[PDB]
Structures are given as structure tokens and as C-alpha cells.
Amino acid sequence: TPEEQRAKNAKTILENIQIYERMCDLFGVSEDDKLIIENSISIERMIRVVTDKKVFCRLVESTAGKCSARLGMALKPNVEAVLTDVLAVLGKRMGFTAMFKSNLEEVLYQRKRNAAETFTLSQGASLEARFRPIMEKHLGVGTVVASIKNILASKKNESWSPLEREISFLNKKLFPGPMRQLCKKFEYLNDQEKQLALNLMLDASLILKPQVTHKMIMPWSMWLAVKKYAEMNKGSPSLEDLAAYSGVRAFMAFNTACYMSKFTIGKGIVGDAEIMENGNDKMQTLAMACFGLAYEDTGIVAAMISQPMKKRYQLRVGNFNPPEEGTIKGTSAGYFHKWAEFGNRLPFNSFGTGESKQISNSGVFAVQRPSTTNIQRLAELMARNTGETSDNFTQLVQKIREQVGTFADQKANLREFTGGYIYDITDVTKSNPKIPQLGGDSFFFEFTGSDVPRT
Amino acid sequence: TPEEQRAKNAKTILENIQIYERMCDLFGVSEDDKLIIENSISIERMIRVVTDKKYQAGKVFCRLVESTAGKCSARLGMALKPNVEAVLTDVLGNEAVLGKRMGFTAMFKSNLEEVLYQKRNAAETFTLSQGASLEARFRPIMEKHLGVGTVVASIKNILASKWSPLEREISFLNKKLFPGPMRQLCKKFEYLNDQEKQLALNLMLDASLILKPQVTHKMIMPWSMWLAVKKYAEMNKGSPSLEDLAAYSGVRAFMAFNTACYMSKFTIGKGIVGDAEIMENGNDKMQTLAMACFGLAYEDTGIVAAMISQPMKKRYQLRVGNFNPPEEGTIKGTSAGYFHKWAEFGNRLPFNSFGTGESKQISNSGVFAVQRPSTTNIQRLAELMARNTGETSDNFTQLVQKIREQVGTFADQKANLREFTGGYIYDITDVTKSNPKIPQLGGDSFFFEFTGSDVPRT
Amino acid sequence: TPEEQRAKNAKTILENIQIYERMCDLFGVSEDDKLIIENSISIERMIRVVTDKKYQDKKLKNKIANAGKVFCRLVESTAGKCSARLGMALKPNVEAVLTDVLGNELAVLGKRMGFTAMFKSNLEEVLYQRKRNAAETFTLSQGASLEARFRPIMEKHLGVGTVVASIKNILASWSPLEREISFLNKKLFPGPMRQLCKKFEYLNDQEKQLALNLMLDASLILKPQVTHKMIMPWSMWLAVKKYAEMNKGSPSLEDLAAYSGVRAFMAFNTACYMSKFTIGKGIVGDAEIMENGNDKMQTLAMACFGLAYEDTGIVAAMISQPMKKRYQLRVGNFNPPEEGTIKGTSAGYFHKWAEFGNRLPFNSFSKQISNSGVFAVQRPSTTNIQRLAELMARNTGETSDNFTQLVQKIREQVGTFADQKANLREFTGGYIYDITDVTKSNPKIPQLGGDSFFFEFTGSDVPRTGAK
Amino acid sequence: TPEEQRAKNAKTILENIQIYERMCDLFGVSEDDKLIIENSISIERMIRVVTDKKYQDKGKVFCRLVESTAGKCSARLGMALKPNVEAVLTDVLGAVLGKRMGFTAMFKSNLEEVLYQKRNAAETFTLSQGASLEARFRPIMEKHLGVGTVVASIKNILASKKNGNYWSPLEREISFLNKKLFPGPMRQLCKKFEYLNDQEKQLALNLMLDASLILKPQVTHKMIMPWSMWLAVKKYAEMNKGSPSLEDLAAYSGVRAFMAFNTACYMSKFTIGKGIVGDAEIMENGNDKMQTLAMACFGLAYEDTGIVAAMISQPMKKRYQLRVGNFNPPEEGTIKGTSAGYFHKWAEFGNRLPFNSESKQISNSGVFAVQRPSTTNIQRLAELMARNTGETSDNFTQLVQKIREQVGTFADQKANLREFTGGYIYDITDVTKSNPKIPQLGGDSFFFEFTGSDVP
Numbered sequence A: 001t002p003e004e005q006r007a008k009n010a011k012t013i014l015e016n017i018q019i020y021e022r023m024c025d026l027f028g029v030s031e032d033d034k035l036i037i038e039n040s041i042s043i044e045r046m047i048r049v050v051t052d053k054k055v056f057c058r059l060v061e062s063t064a065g066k067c068s069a070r071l072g073m074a075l076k077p078n079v080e081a082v083l084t085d086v087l088a089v090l091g092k093r094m095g096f097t098a099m100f101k102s103n104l105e106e107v108l109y110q111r112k113r114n115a116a117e118t119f120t121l122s123q124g125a126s127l128e129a130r131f132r133p134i135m136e137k138h139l140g141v142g143t144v145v146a147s148i149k150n151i152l153a154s155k156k157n158e159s160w161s162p163l164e165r166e167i168s169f170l171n172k173k174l175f176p177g178p179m180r181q182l183c184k185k186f187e188y189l190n191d192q193e194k195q196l197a198l199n200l201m202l203d204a205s206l207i208l209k210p211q212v213t214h215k216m217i218m219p220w221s222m223w224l225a226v227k228k229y230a231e232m233n234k235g236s237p238s239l240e241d242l243a244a245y246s247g248v249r250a251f252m253a254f255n256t257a258c259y260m261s262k263f264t265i266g267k268g269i270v271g272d273a274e275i276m277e278n279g280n281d282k283m284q285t286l287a288m289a290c291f292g293l294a295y296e297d298t299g300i301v302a303a304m305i306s307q308p309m310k311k312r313y314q315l316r317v318g319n320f321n322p323p324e325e326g327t328i329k330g331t332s333a334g335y336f337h338k339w340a341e342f343g344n345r346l347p348f349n350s351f352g353t354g355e356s357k358q359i360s361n362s363g364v365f366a367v368q369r370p371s372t373t374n375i376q377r378l379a380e381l382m383a384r385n386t387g388e389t390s391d392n393f394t395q396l397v398q399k400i401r402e403q404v405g406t407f408a409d410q411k412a413n414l415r416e417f418t419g420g421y422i423y424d425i426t427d428v429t430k431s432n433p434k435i436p437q438l439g440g441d442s443f444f445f446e447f448t449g450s451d452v453p454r455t
Numbered sequence B: 001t002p003e004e005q006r007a008k009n010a011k012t013i014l015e016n017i018q019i020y021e022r023m024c025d026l027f028g029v030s031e032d033d034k035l036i037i038e039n040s041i042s043i044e045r046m047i048r049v050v051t052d053k054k055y056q057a058g059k060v061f062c063r064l065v066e067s068t069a070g071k072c073s074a075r076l077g078m079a080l081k082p083n084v085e086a087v088l089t090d091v092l093g094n095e096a097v098l099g100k101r102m103g104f105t106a107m108f109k110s111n112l113e114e115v116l117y118q119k120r121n122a123a124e125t126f127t128l129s130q131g132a133s134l135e136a137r138f139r140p141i142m143e144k145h146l147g148v149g150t151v152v153a154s155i156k157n158i159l160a161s162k163w164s165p166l167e168r169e170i171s172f173l174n175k176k177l178f179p180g181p182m183r184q185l186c187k188k189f190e191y192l193n194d195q196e197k198q199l200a201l202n203l204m205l206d207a208s209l210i211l212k213p214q215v216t217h218k219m220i221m222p223w224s225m226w227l228a229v230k231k232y233a234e235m236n237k238g239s240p241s242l243e244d245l246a247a248y249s250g251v252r253a254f255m256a257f258n259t260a261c262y263m264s265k266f267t268i269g270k271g272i273v274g275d276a277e278i279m280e281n282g283n284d285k286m287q288t289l290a291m292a293c294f295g296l297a298y299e300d301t302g303i304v305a306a307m308i309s310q311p312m313k314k315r316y317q318l319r320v321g322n323f324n325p326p327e328e329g330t331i332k333g334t335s336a337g338y339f340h341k342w343a344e345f346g347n348r349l350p351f352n353s354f355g356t357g358e359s360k361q362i363s364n365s366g367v368f369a370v371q372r373p374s375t376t377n378i379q380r381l382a383e384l385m386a387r388n389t390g391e392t393s394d395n396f397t398q399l400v401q402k403i404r405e406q407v408g409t410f411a412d413q414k415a416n417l418r419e420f421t422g423g424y425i426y427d428i429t430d431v432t433k434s435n436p437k438i439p440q441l442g443g444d445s446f447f448f449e450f451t452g453s454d455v456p457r458t
Numbered sequence C: 001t002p003e004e005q006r007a008k009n010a011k012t013i014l015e016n017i018q019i020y021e022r023m024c025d026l027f028g029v030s031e032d033d034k035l036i037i038e039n040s041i042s043i044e045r046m047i048r049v050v051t052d053k054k055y056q057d058k059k060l061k062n063k064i065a066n067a068g069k070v071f072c073r074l075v076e077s078t079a080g081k082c083s084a085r086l087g088m089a090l091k092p093n094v095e096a097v098l099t100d101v102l103g104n105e106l107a108v109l110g111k112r113m114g115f116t117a118m119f120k121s122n123l124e125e126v127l128y129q130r131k132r133n134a135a136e137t138f139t140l141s142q143g144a145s146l147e148a149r150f151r152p153i154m155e156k157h158l159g160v161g162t163v164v165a166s167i168k169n170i171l172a173s174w175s176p177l178e179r180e181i182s183f184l185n186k187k188l189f190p191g192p193m194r195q196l197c198k199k200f201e202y203l204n205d206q207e208k209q210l211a212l213n214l215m216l217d218a219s220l221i222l223k224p225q226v227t228h229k230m231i232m233p234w235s236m237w238l239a240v241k242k243y244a245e246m247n248k249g250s251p252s253l254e255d256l257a258a259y260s261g262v263r264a265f266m267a268f269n270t271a272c273y274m275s276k277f278t279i280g281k282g283i284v285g286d287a288e289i290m291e292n293g294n295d296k297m298q299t300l301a302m303a304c305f306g307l308a309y310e311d312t313g314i315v316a317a318m319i320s321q322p323m324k325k326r327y328q329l330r331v332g333n334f335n336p337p338e339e340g341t342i343k344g345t346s347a348g349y350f351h352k353w354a355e356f357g358n359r360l361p362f363n364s365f366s367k368q369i370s371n372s373g374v375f376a377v378q379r380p381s382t383t384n385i386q387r388l389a390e391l392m393a394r395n396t397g398e399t400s401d402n403f404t405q406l407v408q409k410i411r412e413q414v415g416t417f418a419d420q421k422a423n424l425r426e427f428t429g430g431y432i433y434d435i436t437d438v439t440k441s442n443p444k445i446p447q448l449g450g451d452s453f454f455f456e457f458t459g460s461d462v463p464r465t466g467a468k
Numbered sequence D: 001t002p003e004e005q006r007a008k009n010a011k012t013i014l015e016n017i018q019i020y021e022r023m024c025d026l027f028g029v030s031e032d033d034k035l036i037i038e039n040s041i042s043i044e045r046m047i048r049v050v051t052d053k054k055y056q057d058k059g060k061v062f063c064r065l066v067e068s069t070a071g072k073c074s075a076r077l078g079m080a081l082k083p084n085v086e087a088v089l090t091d092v093l094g095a096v097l098g099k100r101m102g103f104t105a106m107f108k109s110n111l112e113e114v115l116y117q118k119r120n121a122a123e124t125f126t127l128s129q130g131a132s133l134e135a136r137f138r139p140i141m142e143k144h145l146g147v148g149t150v151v152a153s154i155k156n157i158l159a160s161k162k163n164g165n166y167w168s169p170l171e172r173e174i175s176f177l178n179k180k181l182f183p184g185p186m187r188q189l190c191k192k193f194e195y196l197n198d199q200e201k202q203l204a205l206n207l208m209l210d211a212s213l214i215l216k217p218q219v220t221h222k223m224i225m226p227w228s229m230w231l232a233v234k235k236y237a238e239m240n241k242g243s244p245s246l247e248d249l250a251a252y253s254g255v256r257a258f259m260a261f262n263t264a265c266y267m268s269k270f271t272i273g274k275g276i277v278g279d280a281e282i283m284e285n286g287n288d289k290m291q292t293l294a295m296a297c298f299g300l301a302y303e304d305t306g307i308v309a310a311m312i313s314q315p316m317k318k319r320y321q322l323r324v325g326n327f328n329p330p331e332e333g334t335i336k337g338t339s340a341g342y343f344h345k346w347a348e349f350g351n352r353l354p355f356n357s358e359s360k361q362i363s364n365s366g367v368f369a370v371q372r373p374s375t376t377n378i379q380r381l382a383e384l385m386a387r388n389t390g391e392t393s394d395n396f397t398q399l400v401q402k403i404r405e406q407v408g409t410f411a412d413q414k415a416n417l418r419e420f421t422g423g424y425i426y427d428i429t430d431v432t433k434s435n436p437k438i439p440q441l442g443g444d445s446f447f448f449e450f451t452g453s454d455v456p
């Protein structure tokens, strides 16, 4: 039952709000300043540092109508004591905080062992090693490949080894076909053959899209803002009503959090330390971080938000650390006027209504007609159905190139997430599907003439 | 001679009408209720069950529709097994002939089941599974009507279960498949190992979804509808005779179907396939009937839409039941004149040209040094090279690759690929084919697409 | 020198006119009936039969006087009507006429009879589509009707299919095979097909058959180079001579003594002032339908220029009558009818002309195909993909490639040009010109489009043809 | 440091001007006539001939020069004894000489490329930058050489081994070719060149040469002018001191090079005579010769003509519409001044791989289940896989096949192919590059196209 899962989420969310508020108290954050997102980022960072098997924390304080950085200090036992009073499961909840931090850094910075152009496949790249197994489904192909490369580099200087676990993770994500067969021989390949297999599977995934799990992960501060709004506005949805990490209720949760949430505007953006931050640009950065939208088609995002969509280097945004001096600004409520489901399966597969199994016609009448076969679906079928087992490493490499080629040759007609639509935020029943008008540059990290000087 | 073949057909049709009427009497069906299609479906099935060696307690039971007024109800008819067999002997005599006539009833039933419902083949190959419902005993007789997926399923069953059955099915598959390495692989199929065999079948099956095979199509309607054709011809002097309409192809078949619908009947009840609480719609059942008789489930919906007298609906927009006798319902007449346009059957390779208006010229040889685009027909050239450049020293791995490349070559031309070039639709009154027409195609052509206008819980 | 070459052509044409007129006299053809094209076809055919010593030696072996009797079916005109007659002459008399005009040597006769055979082959191509080769390769069978003795002499005029057929006959039945392979190699589009020709003798019979059919199929897009000339019946050249003599103001015979270029079109138009053909009952296909003069005129025009396999849009833009597809034409076999009417040819049939494309069509009719960037300025790629592919066809051959590898590379070459089909252009730089524009000052491009196949079945076809 | 490097360039330019003026004096060229470009071409040629040890080892130096008598001009033979010329250069100069003469040879090669279009196929000639250079100058000017030129050098070496007529030279040339070629299997094939057999070597060279016509190689470009034009820069700068200095304009690339060319054109001179390459009876045109001069100094023969036309102040003409001679001193003719301000727009040189740049994002990773077309950039994906997915176990046949497919992939995408992404032309005053402009392209971009407006 959906309500069963929301009740479970509300329990976890209420625990996180309790931890956040009590930790803020322990570090001397006023009740009003608990709603500043910078403080949530810093508090969550401190918990992750302390709980990794006498504590200072950089924080924002509101003063004289402005904001200023202060260094909060607590006894390490008191931090642990607050956690004990409220509370594997801790790993998951902190795994999520790390994932939001990774998704924020993906928007802010493009950032080793993988080619620069594969960076849009590096979801979860900021996660520390301890959180990677827990958040495995959220990690991109590039992130797992980098971990595999790290293991291999560590070797050159148990029934389930870390490398074997990582390979199993990659196999599940990869587009079906010869890439999955190549994973099965990874242990039998030499070091150079391993490097080639990894870079080939990574390059091919830039068109043969992998399956990656997406959730709406926002800072604890914003969940606190949902709770306070729910208590203050009686006709409003409850926290359990909004205790969803996907679907329309997640968008309602984010928009509701934006009524009371706060962030800081200061001197210094990423790139130039002398340029002033802009409120709307920081709002867009916050929205993109909470939904992991850095690598998403900007046209899709632009069709759903209440402000003009901007490319990365047109945004005057800082690092979300507490500024030494600045102004506090409220988040914008109603930022998302349209919503959509997450695509957590292979993008070339169907999602929703457009999921019939008919991909061809068999003619009956001798009537001239065009061929109607869905070439994309046929190519996917043959990837799953016509695999040769006697293929060696060289042969698998070749069919991976050929698999990339057949979809590249079809690029103009390739469709991802067929049957998926955007819906108005009021349209919770999904009764009126809409299709965004896409076109033009869809890359968030494109350089433009409207970019910020020095950035 | 065309008339000789209609005369041959009329004799067979009249024998089937006799069998049907005598079986109905033996099972207590009123004369009016003989024209209910559900009763034809159930009687024909019972004949197949009785002649099936495994199951058909000395009495034979058959569920049937009975009309009380403009109302209908299901009843269980009963006859003795020897009496049912005696009727067949009386009409046909016993010494073959029965197999083919039951094969055709089985083919209609399969085509109806294909419309209503979409083991070893991948789900996406289901549009190549014409005749999939046929019991094993009827497949060799109806071989040309079977799709590539159905033959492959038979081959897979043979291989897993145990002038030869395998050679028969392989020979059948070779005739149907698009020319080229797939036929070469069929010829070497016996020399492959089990793993190679399974890959070859699935590869040839996937490729046929674009490299269309050749399948024979006929207009196969229930005996009751043929009875309706006879009754209308007898009742109306201006109507064509049964022998005039005794055709399974061509315009006369469409006229036979349209004429049968003057007097044929079906039932409207509560409960459709998918939702047991929704009421059936008469027009939706009519479309289902029309599609079943012509085997149109897997056909381009745009083609079908241009020939029928009602707006074309996708599968799950249809409020249609299983065509079994409902416990309670109303009787509805079939719609006469349902096909306002007709076409010939495409029983040959779709990528080949069809009928009048084709030719063997596929290129120009330039004479004058005048700038011109290339005019070569790439589709026809690819098919020519498929038939002309076959290598016998190619092993399994080489043939598999050439199959992928052949799929790739046609996938590259999709935008320019045409099937049944030179084939047109004609008005039902244009029996001479004097006014060829091209249907207005566009949009999704898949009968089984899910839509937003679908029936709740469907 | 153009004038020098026209002088040589005039001498040869005048020799052919003498032979024709003397054979006509020897076979009792009236002066008016010498201008009937049917009589020219039959007389030239009779010379080819008389000059075939294998066939004549066969008759000699298999009495002698009958072998010495030569019969020729001919047209006789009385007023405006015509009838068939059988002319007879003794073989020594026929040979003596050839010896008197052409001398004792009689390689001299081979080329001239090769050309007459080529016109006849080109007429049969228009009338009939054609089975050693697949039916769809018939548009590559230029010169298919030529007897074996004429094929080496007319080699450059032969299509890839015709040479392939000759090779297939040899296999089923310097060196004859090596000569034919060398002919094919020169005609074929450059690349792996030419490499395969060089290995043909080391292939077995099964590989030989596959290679031939593969090279033949690929040529339907990888167009071979074939030599084209304007070849007319001797009677039509006679008509040029008589018109030139009667009308001094008109261009001279040497002025019109060209087998290509605008002067060839002028020669054809000049021949049409006085040339004649027959209209009778019976067309190819139906023996009860009457021939139509305009349809037969189109057939004659197509035969003289070998246009059966040409893009009909090109041809339609150059002729003075609506262009008709094959099976819309009411035309007979050009043999003498038992009864019929005499019809004049139509003057001015060609109002536009063009040069012959005798080289690889994918070549142009400059050598820069790419740019090397100097300034860091955003630009589209400007490389000519068609010319690039052709260059790689000529330059990137692997020698050690075996039969199987070459077969694959031929398929890939077909595929590569098939992928470019929308942008492929043949005879780039070639244009049509008005018959008066002899300087080529006003180039024009035909508005092409629609079906370009002369042998298309249409709904407007003649009963029992395309509607059969 | 940019300004440090500009001062060093001024030192090199000033040394070259000295040599030119001293040789001019020794050969009797008047100061007015020192600015005639034909005299600079001839003096530089004579220096290369004098210093070439390969000719010497196999005693009077004669030089054909232009002499002006007011507006009119005439050819004259300057005369010096070889020891006299040899002594002057040793006195003037006292390794460095080779590079300066390599640059003079490069200008002459780029002039001949414009004027005139045997081991490489004719259609590969647009890959033959630096083809005229003598063997001694090719290693020094390696970065300036085209793929066809290096391949031709390799073919010559191989042919001398086969005939038996004669870092090894071949290894050096292969290393040169490797740095220029488009990344991927072509570079892999270069590294195995010594391990290929003779037939494979020939196939590899022609394949890499043909493929480079679409997979463009990397070639270094600099603005190389005759010494006379640098002398004209010095004279104008000193006489009009309010104008930029020589050291300010001592640049071989960037906007300063274009200004140096424009500044040199105030006082530079060339000859107009009767007789062009082609027909000896047709008169030379100043603007046609001016275009040839501009193209030579920037090596633009093989450049997109639309690109060039958008930057110059005169209508762009194709090669065979130009009435231009061989730039040797004519027997009789007229003197014409060069046109100042010929380039009203400028651009940076593309000395890197043209298909390289632009951000590094070439794909999207979907988040929302929303129907969308694939957005992946096929061109850049292919470039990435060329650089990332290289197999060392690939044999010759496999590398050849991947080269054909690499050519095929870019051919299939030609309509979307972009070269020099991010490069724009700028106004001659826009030294800040503040206002980018895009050339209005379309139509034939080939300088050597045959046209109906061509010269008999």
C-alpha cells in the first residue's frame, strides 16, 4: 500500500528532523537559523565525519539583519549522545545525505581515471567508499568503473571480493547485450584487456544508456520546513502525505519545503571570488541538486520550473558553504509547476502506457505501405535474444562497437522513456499528459556567450 | 479456371453447411439460432474435440446459445458420440477430407483468438505467430497459413520433446523466410548443435520482424456465416448465388462476408475480455468479427481502417467478449456492407512487388552525360543480392553475421522501405480493379497499442 | 582534330552507302524503297549472315547451289502501301560487292558489321527486355544481341552483363576467357570488383559463378563505364547524303559525319527528312493491334542512341513528342510486314542534345574534394563524400585478400554508396543543350522526377502488355 | 611570456631585414626597389641556393631582379661572385640560419600552392602543405608540413630502398605523421609502420591520406611574409611614429600578424606584367595578384573560400578566375602598390585538430521518465572512442577495417560535422575578441574549382 510506505518514510523523516534540530541546538543554532540550508549541509557533513569508525562545525548565524559565519563547537560524546537518544539503517540515512551532497557538487563542478567526456555517467561520484554499496542503485556507470579502476590500481602497487561486487553492480546497470557478456569474462582478462573493456562499456553507455535509480533527496532542513508548514497550516497535507521520495508527492514535498527554507547570498561564486551570488540562480542550483538534475536534458527541466532555465556558467552561485558575510534569502515556493516520474529503468525501454509488445506488422492485404517496424525495439530485442556464448574477448569488443553503431545510425529516431509525460502539479491523477517541446542544446554544462566573465 | 474453383468451393461449402445444420438439429438448436455465430464456433470446436484422439461420458456436451425473443441465454446441449460421428459419415462418407475442413475451422478460431488475446518465443515476436492456436494435427494441412513464429515454435517443440517432422517444418520455414543467409542457415540447420539451433531460430525470428516472410492468407469465416450466404441467396432473387460468392480470396470473398452479414447474428452480454463487469458493444464485436475472418490482428490498422464501415479502434478500446455463449444477453445482427473497400491477399514476400504495375527494371544505365540522381532501387538490389550471392562454404558464425548485416541494411533504408509495391485497395463495387486507390496511412499502425482512450481495466 | 575525324567518318559512311545501294540493286530494291529502314535492317542482317564463315561452313558441310543462294525478306512500296517480298542473290555475288567496295582484305568489314549488329542489338533492347543472368540485371546487357564474332571488336560498347554472359557461356561450354575478364575489369567500378577480376582464373567454378553474379548485381548501383555512340541504319545515312546533295544550304555530309556530339543529333534529324518505315497490323505482344507512327518513331530514336536503359526523364526533355513507357507503345518488330502503309520519319525529333557519358558515371563530366583549415573558424565539413569513396575505391586495395574477403568488401562497397543514395550524382557537370546551342553557351538541367524506368508497367499500357 | 616572445620575434625579424638590405646592396637594388616583393622572393631564393651544401658539393651567384624606372619596371641580372656572397652572410650572422630559410621556403611553397595545383593521388593535394620545401627544411618546418607531404617523403624513402638507389629518416617522418593524424586507429597504424610489409605500408599510407580528407589532420599555421614586407613594416612604423612599433607588431599569429600584414601593405610593391600562369598573352591584374599575395602569406590555397572572403576587403576569386603570374621579375611591366587594409576581419590560426575544440558534455543521463529524443553527439562520441578504445592486439587488417568505419562514421554524420567549434572571425580593431562573428557560408568552398568565369 502506498500509504504504508509513506508511513515508513515519515518515521525515518521524523527521526532525521529530530536529529537535525537537536544537533543544531547542541551547536548553538537559533530556531530560525535551523531553516538555513547551509546549516543542514554542514550539520549533515559533521554527522558523517563523526560517525565514520571536540567537534567543530562551520555554520551560518543571522545577525543584524544579515548573516555571518560562526564556528560551532560541541563535545564529541554529546554529538554521539544526541544520536543515541533519538535512535546499517544509520548508514542508509547518512548514505542519502551524502547523495544529496554529491548531487549538489555535480551541479556546481563538472569533476580522474575516466575520460572527461564520460562525466555525465558519474552519478554519486562524491560518495565516500562506505556509502557506495548502500547507494549502489543510485551510482552511475562511470562511478562504478572508477571504483573498479581504483581497485585495479591498488592491486598493482572471500567468496565475494570488492572487485567482484563492483562488477556485479556494473552488469546490472549496463544496457543489455555484449557488454553484459563482457562483464562475465572480466576476471579472466589481463590488465590491458580490463582497461579496454571498462572504457568501451563506459563510452558506449553515453548512447546505450544505463539504468540508474533516482530519488528526490533534499536536506534535512527542508524536511523540517515541511513539518513546520504542516503544523502551522491546518488545511495542508500532513508530513505523511508528503513523505515520498518519488512521484508527485515528492514534488509537493519540495515545493512545500520552499515556503520556509532559507539560503545565503554572498560575495564569491564558483570560479570568480569577487562576483555576487544571485538568488534565482542559487534557487535553480538547489532544485537541480535535490532532484539530481545536473546531467538531465535542460529542455525537460525548463518545461517544469517557474523560472527561465539557465546553463551552468550563466549561474552566479557559490559553494553553499557558510559565507563570512552575506544576506539571507528565502527559497521560492511553487518552483515546480509540472512534475514527472523518475526513470529508474533502461531509458530505451518503455515507461507507462507506451509499453505494448507489438513492434511490427504482418501484412495480410497486398496494399503498398511503408515498413512500420520499430527499429529501436528490434535492436534491443536482438541484444537480449541473439547472444553467442563462444564469443571471445576480441569478438565481444567488436559487437559492442557494432551495437553502438546500430543505435548511432538510428540516432534521429531514437527515443528514451517512451510513454513518459510531464503533468501539472495539480494533476495528481495524471489525467492530462503533456509532452515538452524539446530542441536546441540540452547540455547543462554547455559554454555560452551569456556566460559569467571568468566563469 | 476461376469458375471451376468456385464450383469446387461451393461443393465443399455446401457439405460444411449440411454438417452444421445436422449437428445443430442433433444438439437441439432452433433454425433461427443456427445463424448465431457463437453456435457455429461451439459446434465447430465440438467436431474437432470429438475427432481428437486424446479426450473425446459417452454423451458429447456442447454449450450453445438459445434465443427466447430479442434475448439470449446459454444452455448445455447433449448428443451421443456415435450420432455425431454418424452425421459426418452421412455427409462426407468414411474411408483426409475432414482434416482440411477442420483445419480451416481451427484457423478461424486461431485468428479470432489472435484478435482477442495477444511459450518458447520472445513476446515481441507474437505478430509472426499466425495460426498459433492450431493443434498439431492441423498444422501440416494449414502449413502455408502459419507464420514464421508458429513454425519456429513447432520446431522448438520437436527438438525439446525428442519425410521427417523436423525436415517438414524446416522445409516449411525455408519457404517462408526472406531470401538470403536465413534460408542458407535453414539448409544447414540439421548440422548445427542444439545451442546453435536455438540461436538460429531466435535470430531468424527476430530478423523476420523487418525482413518480412511470406505467409498465405484466406478469408475463413464460420460455417453459420456461409449458411447465411446461402439463405440470403435463396431468399433474394437479385443476390449473387452461393457459387458466385464461393471464394476465399479476391473481391468475391469480401462480397461473401458482406452478404453473410445480412442474416448472421452474435450475442451482446455482460463481460468483456479484461473486465467481467463491462457491457459489450455491438460495433466493437463487429470489428472483432471482421478482423477474425480475415486474420487482421497483426495488420497495419491504417490499412484496415480504410476498408471497414466503422471507425477503427485499437484492441483495448474494444468492449468485446470471448465469443462464447453468454449466460444472459441480447442478440444483435451483423452489419451488412462492412467492407466498402477490398484488396487482394499478399501471399508472397512483402518486399517483392505485387501484381500488375511492377517490372524487373531496378536501375538505369546512363547514356547521355547529363547530371542526374542515382535511380537504383536499393530495396530491390538488396533482395537481388540476397537471392544471387549465396555462399555454401559459410559456416554458422559467418551466416549469423550475414543475417545481422542483412537486418542492418534494411534497417538503414526503413524510411524508403516499401512492402507490397504496386498493390492497391479497390472499392467494393470496383470488381474490375479499374480505379486503384492508396490508403491514407500515418500514426501508430499497431492494433495492440495501449492508448489513453482504452477501456478501464484494459 | 574534329574536322579530320569527320573526314574519316565521311569516307567510312560513303563506303557503307555504296555497299547498301549495291546490295539493294542486287536484291531488287527500288530507289524509293532503299530509304525504308526495314530494308536496311534486313540487308545488314544478310551481310552478317553471309560473312559468318562458321555458319556458312556448317551449311557447306550439311545442295551446294542452295548453300550458294542467299534470300532476304524485303519491303516493296507501291504508292503509299507496302508488301513483303523475298529477294534472292548468289553468295559469290554478295561477296563480290563487298570486295569491290572494301577491297580484298575484308578486319575492315568486322568493325562496320559490328556497328550494324550494335544498332540491331539496340533496337531489340527497346522492343524486348531480354536468361544466363538474373532478370533484374538486364539493364546492364548493352550489346547482348551481338554474335560472338562481333563482341571483341565492339568490346567498349558492351555492358557488364553482356561480358558476364559471354564468360558464363565459356565456362559452361591471350585466351577467350582472359580477354573477356580483361574487358570486364576495365568496365567495372574501381575497387574490390577489379581485384576479384584479377583472381578470376584462380577461382573454382563455384567461386567464378558467385563472383560474376556479385559483380553484376553491384554494377546496378556501382555503375560501370560503357561506350556510347549514335549508330544508325545505313539507309538513314543514305537519307543524309541525298538531303545534303538536294539542299546545298543544308550542312554537308562531312559536316554531319559524327557519331557523337551535336552533329550526331543533327545527322539524325537530317536523316529524318527522307527516311521511311512501315506501319502494319501486329505489335510486339498482340498480333491484332495496329502500329502507331509516333510510337515507332520513338522506338527508332531510342534504338539509334541506345536509350532503352536510359532515364526516361532525360530522354523526355530532349524529344519533340510526349515520352511513352515501353508497354504504352504500339510498335512491331521492324521486320517487313506482309501488308502495311509507308510512313515518313519525323524531322526535328530531338530539340535538345547532350554528350555521351562513356566514362564512370560517378566521376564528373576539378580535383579538389576537401579543404584544409587554416583559420580557427567554426565551419561545416566540406568534403565531397561521393568523391572520397571513389578515391578510396581506387587507392585502398589489399593484395593478399582472398576470395571470401573480396566478396565481403564488394558488399561493403555496395552498402557505402547505398548509404549515400540521396546525395549520389552521376555525370556531375553534364547538361542538355538546345539543338541550335552548338557552342554549349546555355546549359540546362532536365527537371527529373518520377519513375525513370522505360520498362515500367503502367495503367495506361496497351492491352495484352502490362495488363496481360 | 607573450611580450617577451614578441621582443624575441622582433630580434629575428630585424636580423632578417639586415640580411635582405645587405644582399640588396651587394646586388645593386635601389632603396625604392627593395620594397618590390619580387626582389624579396628572388633574394631569399638565392640565399637558400647559396647555403645549400647539397648543390655546392655536386662559383658565381646570379640573381634576376626588378628595377624600377618611375612607374615602369624591367628585369635585370644582379651579379656577385659566390665568395663575395658567402663572406657577407658570415659577417652578418657570424642552426638559426636554417629555420629562417625554412620560413622563407615556406612562403614560397605557400605561394606555389596558390599558383599551381606524383606519388600521391591528385585529389589528396589539399593535404600537401609545405610540398615545395627542399629536404633540408622539412624537419625544421615539420609542424607546418601537411599529411600528404610527409607521406610523400616516406614514399620517396621507400622507393629508394626498393630501387636500391639509396632516429632513421623514415622513423623521424613516421613520428611526424603520427603527431598530425586524427586520433584513433590511424595513429595506431603509424606506430606499426616499421612492422608492416611493403604492400601493407603502401596501403596504410594511402588509407591514412584518403581518410585525412574528412578526418582532418593537425597542421601548424603561421603568417609568413617576404622579408621585403617586414622591411616595409619597419619603415612605416619609424616614419609614422604615432603608429604601432615593429616590436608591437612582431607577431606571426593573432591580430598583430594581420596588422603587420596590413601595415606592410602601405609601402610594399609588386609588378604587373603581361603573361600569366597558363596563357602568356594575358595581362596580370593587381587585385588578382594582391589576392594571391594575401593567400600566400597566410597559406590559404586550401582554405574554405567563404572563410577567406568574409575577412578581406575585395571580392574573393577562385584560382582560374585570377589573372596572376609566377611572381618572377618580368622583362617589362608596371609597378603596383599593395592594398592596405586588405583584411578587415581576422581570426586565430587553427594549429590543433580541427574536430577538437566547447564543454566536455556530449550526452545526457536521464532523470525524469519523459519521452525525449537521444541527445548524444555522435561526432564527439566517435572521437572519444577513437582516443579511449584502442586495442594493441589489433593486427593490420583489423586496423584498416576500423579506419574505414571511422571514415564511415564521420561520413554518415557529415551534415552535422563541425570543425573548429568555438572559433569566430573578429573585426580588425577587436583586439579584445569581445565581439565574435560567424562567416556567412554556403556554396562551393574550393579555391581550385573550375568555373564558367575562368580565364582562357
Ligand SMILES: [Cl-]
Pocket (backbone or CB within 6 Å): C002, C006, C258, C261, C263
Ligand atoms: Cl565532330
